[PDB]
Automatic annotation (TrEMBL), chains A, C, E:
It comes from the Viruses. Belongs to the influenza viruses hemagglutinin family. GO terms for molecular function: host cell surface receptor binding. The keyword Transmembrane applies. Homotrimer of disulfide-linked HA1-HA2. The keyword Membrane applies. It is found in: Host apical cell membrane; Virion membrane. Residues 30-82 form a coiled coil. Keywords: Coiled coil, Disulfide bond, Fusion of virus membrane with host endosomal membrane, Fusion of virus membrane with host membrane, Glycoprotein, Hemagglutinin, Host cell membrane, Host membrane, Host-virus interaction, Lipoprotein, Membrane, Palmitate, Transmembrane, Transmembrane helix, Viral attachment to host cell, Viral envelope protein, Viral penetration into host cytoplasm, Virion, Virus endocytosis by host, Virus entry into host cell. Binds to sialic acid-containing receptors on the cell surface, bringing about the attachment of the virus particle to the cell. This attachment induces virion internalization of about two third of the virus particles through clathrin-dependent endocytosis and about one third through a clathrin- and caveolin-independent pathway. Plays a major role in the determination of host range restriction and virulence. Class I viral fusion protein. The chain holds residues 369 to 515 of 583 of the full protein. This is Hemagglutinin. GO terms for cellular component: host cell plasma membrane; viral envelope; virion membrane. One of its GO terms (biological process) is fusion of virus membrane with host plasma membrane.
Length: 147, 332, 147, 332, 147, 332
């Protein structure tokens, strides 16, 4: 239901699962949810903000009359196109490598703050969902999700 | 959280990975019409208000095609090989004159001069009368000729001459290039004898900024008339241009049949020029050579690379996507 | 023998050392060993797959006759060579920075899975080799190395 | 695990670090022979089947050097300064003709035309007979001349003339450039008088696509014969070429001694051209200007940068290595 | 005083705070301090060491006479300038992203070595300053700061 | 540790962040004087020891401006449009001669030849006497002329002639380009008749490496004298140059008034050339076109991009800063 995954609702795209004996209390951390959205927004903008100069024709190079110069001009435009495309691909690929490799830090950070809020009472393995030594109801879980 | 996550993004070192959501960064533009670039003045024809004129008639000063050329920062190269639509028959392919309008459109500011660069009547070769043609009607429908050239026909003493030299002064202001249009007339043996007094082929040269040329006229045997006023003519003209970089004078050498420079073009600055096709319809944020106007819906595009002006998407080789979500985590 | 290092066999290039009172049981995690090999293989290929357009002569530029155009053409080829070399060096240097800085995560990840398999019985410092509160023989260690 | 680990790799921010294993990414190529590029047709000589001919004899249509030029996408510029090996003596260094073959090799598809561009016998200057030379033997060992030119010698009325003009038609199909070869003959005073009727220096011009030239013949006093059929001659020829961009005609102006265009070259597409040296031995994945054929054993190379064609390693400034292992961990 | 921060002395730019009942003992780890300085120095140098070829005029291209070639030459120089600037900006931006994201590893690493030196006696949350189960005086703290 | 930390640095993916300390990587240079590049020999004037001479007088061999040109690897283009300061009046703007010195400065090694390329006295056109001028005083204050040209005036038989041809030999060593300076004289009708015997306009051509030109002299009606010895003259000269790439000869065609080549320039290698302004004051690590000498205090700079030579900072678009410290941590 909360761990592993199933074809449920992903509307709060929540980063951690609930725990406890009170049936299955569920609450979402919407501060975390907004952080993730704002973070991707900033990354998208640093890429969409890239500006390069555009290419145009040489104003003094007339067709036919200066065909040799123009052949070189085409070569320059074409080589430049590979260069800029490669810089963009690297910027995007590095952005994605960074995003992909931030997956574990985000999840580990969430478990660490649960320990801060819950205290030195427990450890967990595998998925690692922190589990308490006391019962916590929906009101309790909402307070935790909200800090 | 996890969802059905078959989206694929690439990383620099892990190759391809599956993610739970992506943000496409690229699009593929669809070819459309050229448009005015938004904000910046865009030049189509050299003189948009010179009706029943083309860029080469305007560039040559054809009667009734004169007028102001608007300044512009962006220009579209509508005609790769400009043509004329009137006045005297021109053997266009003998020189480089067809590209004159494509040179003028490359400047930000283009104006025709206000005064004749050369006094055509009083010039080496003796007193001249200035020729007109029925093919080149003026604003009162009389016989005119190109504003940029004087057809200098000897008044008297119609004899053969030796090459004569005129230094063509620089008349534009500092910083402006001066483009001088000059040329020569030629006719069959009978008319050369009646009009100039010398039926043999005439020779002409020109020089500016170290660049020189040479022409020999053709007597009789002219090619069929195209791109002109429609009246038959026995003769033809050859028209060329000389570019005098700012501060320099140029030189023209001639015998009989010289069309002397009169008004000249003064020009400065630089326009951004791309190839394209008129009419310009509406406005666009970017003008692309292959796709016409674009509005940059995505920061990057895939497709055919070409020159462009404006707030353009950047061409890239492949589709690009950012990961938005985490790696795919199958429901286990 | 297992910690620090010595001039022994490195054939399984193993990421963790054994522990326990049963003499010195030794087993290798060959899943981990293959991951490391497959990971470097993928990185090598993303670099060897770089394709750039090659440079050639201008077809209309004749020697001597158009020497000035050709001088510029040489300038273009030469500047392009620095540009591409720099992009490659950055891609390689970033790949190496990433590899070098992945050393601790690989080792920490290995110790974390040992804790998953062994349970919340112990901690360790310095090299951090997890040590149990019970005896584990070679058969036991092989089961652990194999999951 | 740790081992003796002195391998050094560099990182972007940590400078140099010691690792337990590396993967060299670069090699250093060793200069070898040029080879056919693997897969793609590679052009060496213009006509590989025209024996005892060089590229300039083929380009000029020397008798017995005619034939088909294979199309190719890759060409090797074997001769920087092409030479001839037969027919009439040519004052090669008076014009730009030595580079003609290097222009033809730059096209993907090159063919000589099937029909004469100009009727040489019936042309301005009066009826001509077409000259031949003992230096230019044909396939039946009679006296021929270059296929691309007609040596137009007046049949009668051997008098001096005024410059005459021929418009050279475009005969290639659309999209093909037309390369016209033309030239002139000159001799000492005695022979000019017997052959053409005018011993003074003759003048010639040409024009295409705005590009013009001018020549004046030399009478007598010719340079020593080289690169020709080996028979002594009192005269010499000057050969040039004109390039007519697709759709355009060109113009030739001449007096006596004109070698009129006959067959012309039609060409299209673009070959990839690098400098190199024939013969081509075997095949290679990449052809490099400094190293000859290469087979890309490593993705990058160090060494001297130069142009290349094919599945080439990418040049880099330094040796490059990936770390394969971890940082060096001394046995402590 | 040590946590949070105030307008005090930052001369040893120290990475961790002290703990204990002995008033407020304070000692700095100067090995850590030097590591941080040497690390930034190396990064600064890998950037200042970037070398690219410089641009000059074509030796055969004369003013006016070859104005068309020169217009293209200016285009080439200008496009190259964007290319190099972009490569530098990326190298600098990646260097900064790496520096910014190294903040937590540096601090976590410092707390981990305190645990190595102090033993498995305690845990802490929030700022995480390790706190002992025994009194440690200034001499004790100096020994810890010094290893 | 934390401090007041408003410094802002940018990251590739997080946009802008606040840090506790930065290292500026960029500076903004202040325009200063050009200076010798440190270490490498820097060329200012072509002949620093040829006093009361400018680069065009040195290039033309003006009497008393001859001498050795130091080799250099770095050159500064002091005069965009070089001028003369003495000897015979030159109609400079008729040709490309003003740029000759800017070609010579582009070579690493430039020397004037030791022997005349052409025997001027014995040449086509008949025996010549070599002309001198009061405007061109030599080292003993007699009448000289440019070292690079012989003013060839017929000794006798002062008649009109037909164009004559001289092949100009290559006299430089292999690898050197040979720059030949030649030209022609012209005068009014009276003096042409007394000096050459032919008052009509004379024609000249030249050819090298496929590049050709053509000139027609002007008879009388000359422009006002500038940039010369100061004595009045009725005539004027036209001076041009021909560049013969290594191993090739060139050709000059002429009638009367020819200034024949004598000494020629031999040159090789390449200098690094930037635009600038002399005098050079002190030394600098980098010479920048807009900023003069720079000493690279920071690895990068912002400001106006331009060409440069030496151990230069690299231009960047924005100020750049490294983070030195951690992110800002407000005192909470
Ligand atoms: C359009 O073209 C016509 C000619 O094709 C121009 O008309 C001509 O204008 C000139 C200048 O005013 C007239 O010249 C003068 O003629 C008188 C005759 O007595 C003479 O005494 C003067 O010394 C001078 O030569 C010319 O005769 C006249 N020709 C005709 C047929 O009217 C007309 O001005 C042009 N229109 C425009 C707007 O340019
Ligand atoms: C050279 O060009 C001139 C034109 O500038 C040619 O002259 C023209 O020749 C035609 C005949 O072929 C003449 O037409 C006739 O005119 C009379 C006039 O009374 C009329 O009665 C006839 O019914 C017919 O229309 C025309 O007038 C004449 N024009 C001029 C200005 O002379 C000349 O023939 C050409 N010569 C060569 C060798 O090509
Ligand atoms: C890029 O964006 C511009 C701005 O949205 C697009 O041009 C605009 O297109 C609309 C629809 O064709 C025009 O609306 C018209 O308004 C008149 C008002 O009287 C109305 O009578 C018409 O029926 C219609 O609704 C709008 O005026 C026009 N804007 C401009 C400045 O011309 C443009 O097409 C987009 N181009 C691309 C490549 O996406
Ligand atoms: C190789 O060159 C020789 C000449 O050097 C060519 O032979 C010549 O061919 C022409 C055309 O068939 C002959 O012209 C005709 O001669 C008869 C003579 O009665 C005349 O009545 C015709 O009106 C016409 O002028 C020419 O005489 C002949 N010359 C010789 C010496 O045989 C030969 O055809 C060329 N071979 C090839 C493959 O091109
Ligand atoms: C201009 O060029 C022509 C060649 O096209 C030169 O004519 C040749 O002159 C030589 C003598 O120097 C003649 O050789 C002699 O021929 C007779 C024939 O009976 C023979 O008995 C002698 O033993 C000797 O071989 C040659 O035939 C003649 N050829 C032609 C076609 O005329 C001419 O001398 C050159 N003139 C100048 C001013 O350079
Ligand atoms: C790039 O790789 C190709 C392909 O391996 C290399 O060319 C090949 O070289 C071998 C050895 O020289 C040739 O083998 C010969 O086969 C004949 C078969 O009858 C045998 O009689 C000979 O004794 C010999 O064993 C092989 O044919 C040849 N392949 C091709 C397509 O020509 C090439 O040398 C490598 N180039 C570089 C730069 O490394
Ligand atoms: C500076 O220019 C003057 C002339 O403007 C040069 O003086 C001239 O030098 C030549 C060569 O030595 C003298 O020619 C000879 O004259 C004698 C007279 O009897 C004659 O027999 C010889 O056959 C030969 O023609 C010429 O007369 C002399 N002119 C004058 C006025 O002295 C002077 O040499 C030049 N200085 C330098 C350093 O180049
Ligand atoms: C063509 O150029 C020549 C110069 O090379 C001009 O000749 C000069 O004409 C002036 C008069 O305008 C002469 O001045 C007079 O000389 C006599 C000598 O006895 C003196 O008594 C007078 O007081 C006065 O100074 C000058 O000598 C003469 N020089 C030469 C070398 O002939 C000629 O007039 C010009 N012709 C044309 C059509 O422009
Ligand atoms: C780049 O660095 C060089 C080297 O520091 C700077 O040039 C040097 O400037 C100093 C002060 O102007 C010169 O010192 C002088 O020494 C003489 C010794 O007799 C003394 O009499 C003077 O009063 C003065 O102290 C020093 O000689 C000079 N070095 C050289 C090689 O000329 C240069 O100005 C700096 N340029 C830039 C763009 O920052
Ligand atoms: C990145 O993915 C998230 C998750 O799907 C997108 O945010 C959702 O937007 C819809 C819009 O109707 C909302 O109903 C959902 O509640 C949002 N989900 C979450 C978890 O907030 C987000 O728009 C995507 N961003 C981009 C740039 O594509
Ligand atoms: C990672 O991505 C690849 C490509 O998206 C997945 O491989 C393909 O998955 C589709 C699913 O419909 C299959 O039809 C194809 O046959 C698979 N390709 C191959 C070569 O087998 C891959 O499965 C994804 N990773 C995970 C964990 O599912
Ligand atoms: C990276 O390093 C590993 C470790 O040395 C290489 O893998 C070894 O290959 C030999 C081949 O005979 C085997 O006998 C060893 O058992 C392998 N070791 C391990 C730990 O698997 C690997 O080939 C290197 N990769 C590259 C691209 O150089
Ligand atoms: C990191 O690498 C450098 C270079 O590989 C090592 O420094 C050199 O090591 C060799 C070993 O034979 C010595 O002979 C040299 O004298 C050393 N250079 C200097 C300047 O002292 C360095 O030792 C390596 N790091 C470690 C931990 O060993
Ligand atoms: C990076 O920041 C540190 C911290 O401010 C700078 O080091 C200080 O330098 C002053 C120089 O008088 C010393 O008094 C301080 O004690 C140093 N502080 C520390 C913590 O060591 C360092 O110079 C800066 N580096 C750069 C390149 O700007
Ligand atoms: C991060 O940096 C930005 C820019 O340095 C800070 O925003 C500005 O801070 C100054 C401080 O004097 C205010 O006067 C401005 O009004 C602030 N800008 C805006 C748009 O409000 C920002 O505060 C910094 N982050 C933190 C945590 O302080
Ligand atoms: C000339 O312009 C008018 C409009 O002013 C137009 O009706 C006419 O058709 C045009 N003539 C030609 C030949 O295009
Ligand atoms: C030129 O015009 C005449 C009619 O005046 C026509 O018969 C001839 O075919 C035309 N020639 C060409 C090439 O169009
Ligand atoms: C001409 O070709 C034949 C082979 O067909 C060859 O034997 C002969 O040597 C060649 N002649 C020359 C001059 O190379
Ligand atoms: C030209 O040939 C003659 C023999 O016909 C020879 O004596 C002379 O030296 C040769 N000249 C050159 C420059 O080779
Ligand atoms: C010529 O040089 C001397 C120094 O040798 C100088 O005094 C004189 O003013 C200079 N003459 C001119 C016209 O500059
Ligand atoms: C040329 O010189 C004369 C004096 O000899 C002077 O009157 C005239 O104005 C000058 N012309 C020019 C264009 O300077």
């Amino acid at each position: 239901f909360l761990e592993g995954g199933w074809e449920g609702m992903i509307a709060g795209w929540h980063g951690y699962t609930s725990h406890g004996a009170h049936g299955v209390a569920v609450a979402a951390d919407l501060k975390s949810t907004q952080e993730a959205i704002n973070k991707i927004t900033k990354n998208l903008n640093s890429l969409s903000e890239l500006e390069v100069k555009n290419l145009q024709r040489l104003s003094g190079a007339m067709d036919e009359l200066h065909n040799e110069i123009l052949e070189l001009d085409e070569k320059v435009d074409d080589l430049r196109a590979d260069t800029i495309s490669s810089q963009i691909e690297l910027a995007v690929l590095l952005s994605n490598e960074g995003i992909i490799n931030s997956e574990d830090e985000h999840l580990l950070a969430l478990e660490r703050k649960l320990k801060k809020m819950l205290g030195p009472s427990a450890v967990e393995i595998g998925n690692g969902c922190f589990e308490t030594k006391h019962k916590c109801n929906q009101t309790c879980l909402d307070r935790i999700a909200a800090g | 959280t996890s969802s059905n996550s078959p989206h694929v993004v690439k990383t620099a070192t892990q190759g391809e990975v599956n993610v739970t959501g992506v943000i496409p960064l690229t699009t593929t533009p669809t070819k459309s019409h050229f448009a005015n670039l938004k904000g910046t003045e865009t030049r189509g024809k050299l003189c948009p208000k010179c009706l029943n004129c083309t860029d080469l008639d305007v560039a040559l000063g054809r009667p009734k095609c004169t007028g102001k050329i608007p300044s512009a920062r962006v220009s579209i190269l509508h005609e790769v090989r400009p043509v004329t639509s009137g006045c005297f028959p021109i053997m266009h392919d003998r020189t480089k004159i067809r590209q004159l309008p494509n040179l003028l459109r490359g400047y930000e500011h283009v104006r025709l001069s206000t005064h004749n660069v050369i006094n055509a009547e009083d010039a080496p070769g003796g007193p001249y009368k200035i020729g007109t043609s029925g093919s080149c009607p003026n604003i009162t429908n009389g016989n005119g000729f190109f504003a940029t050239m004087a057809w200098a026909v000897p008044d008297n003493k119609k004899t053969a001459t030796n090459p004569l030299t005129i230094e063509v002064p620089y008349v534009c202001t500092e910083g402006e290039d001066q483009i001088t249009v000059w040329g020569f007339h030629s006719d069959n043996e009978t008319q050369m004898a009646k009009l100039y007094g010398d039926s043999k082929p005439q020779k002409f040269t020109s020089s500016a900024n170290g660049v020189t040329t040479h022409y020999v006229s053709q007597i009789g045997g002219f090619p069929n008339q195209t791109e002109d006023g429609g009246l038959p003519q026995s003769g033809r003209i050859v028209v060329d241009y000389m570019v005098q970089k700012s501060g320099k004078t140029g030189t023209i050498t001639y015998q009989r049949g010289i069309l002397l420079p009169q008004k000249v073009w003064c020009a400065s600055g630089r326009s951004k020029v791309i190839k394209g096709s008129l009419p310009l319809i509406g406005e666009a944020d970017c003008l692309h050579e292959k796709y016409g106007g674009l509005n940059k819906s995505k920061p990057y595009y895939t497709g055919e690379h070409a020159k462009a002006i404006g707030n353009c998407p950047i061409w890239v080789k492949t589709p690009l996507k950012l990961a938005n979500g985490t790696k795919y985590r199958p429901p286990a």
